[PDB]
Amino acid sequence: QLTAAQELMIQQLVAAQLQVTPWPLGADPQSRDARQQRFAHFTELAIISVQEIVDFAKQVPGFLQLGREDQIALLKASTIEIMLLETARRYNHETECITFLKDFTYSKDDFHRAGLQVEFINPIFEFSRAMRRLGLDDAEYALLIAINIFSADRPNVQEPGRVEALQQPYVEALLSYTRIKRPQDQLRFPRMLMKLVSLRTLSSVHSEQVFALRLQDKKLPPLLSEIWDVHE
């Protein structure tokens, strides 16, 4: 059985989880004006998502007690990975579109028309399509977010000991949870850790997509730029 502490920590995350430039209509796929506007649109959706991630992290117990520089370091690293997880969760399997809201849904072709390369687009969609087999519930997703946030090995983490100590109870709860819910499925926890490694890969692919965009004279807005731009 889940302990009182584990029930509590999960409830807290599950509760915490609870709480734009228009697409250019009918513009040529090749239009440089329109590719820029399609890009700007994604950019603004991304900014909404990061604010959500910040506001979530702030509610996770212990996060706000970390030094200010660790808070930023953890958030800089996990932002895109949490975004990708959330993208997977909302992904429409019938229509093959990542779903931001209700009528805000995007296919591989929509991303390609925004200037993105199939090298980035194909993986994000395969990751989303693949997550369904896992069949994660709300408690499992939230646990995964929290464990992603408290990764002691991110660039520029100054108190990784503290960070790992915060992560541990969440890893323990997730293991217990999958064991209780799917006792016959011994590969389930490994499957979850596998998604955590794919998220690292995808995060790197995203970073290169960002750089590639800069080479096409496409610049992120200041908020995203501070998270994702390379600079020497």
Ligand X SMILES: O=S(=O)(c1ccccc1)N(CC(F)(F)F)c1ccc(C(O)(C(F)(F)F)C(F)(F)F)cc1
Q: How far is the CB of 174 from ligand X (least distance, A)?
A: 22
Out of 6, 78, 79, 87, point to the residue binding ligand X (CB under 6 A): 87
Residues 165-204 that bind ligand X (CB under 6 A): none
Given a contact cutoff of 8 angstroms between Cβ atoms, the answer to whether 142 and 16 are in contact is yes
Residues 7-66 that bind ligand X (CB under 6 A): 42-43, 45-46, 49
According to the binding rule CB under 6 A, does residue 98 interact with ligand X? yes
According to the binding rule CB under 6 A, does residue 100 interact with ligand X? yes
CA dist 97 → 27, 86, 102, 110, 122 (Å): 20, 13, 11, 9, 12
Considering the complex, state which of residue 66 and residue 224 has its C-beta at the smaller distance from ligand X: 224
Given a contact cutoff of 8 angstroms between Cβ atoms, the answer to whether 220 and 43 are in contact is yes
According to the binding rule CB under 6 A, does residue 213 interact with ligand X? yes
Cα 47 to Cα 188: distance, rounded to the nearest angstrom: 32
Question: Helix or strand or coil: residue 97?
Answer: strand
Q: How many alpha carbons fall within 13 Å on the CB side of residue 51?
A: 7
Instruction: Specify the stretch interacting with ligand X by CB under 6 A; choose among 13-21, 54-62, 191-199, 207-215.
Output: 207-215
The one-letter code for the residue type at 195 is K
CA 231 distance to own-chain centroid: 23
Q: How far is the CB of 143 from ligand X (least distance, A)?
A: 20
According to the binding rule CB under 6 A, does residue 227 interact with ligand X? no
**Interface ranges with ligand X (CB under 6 A):** 42-43, 45-46, 49, 83-84, 87, 98, 100, 106, 116, 124, 206, 209-210, 213, 220, 224
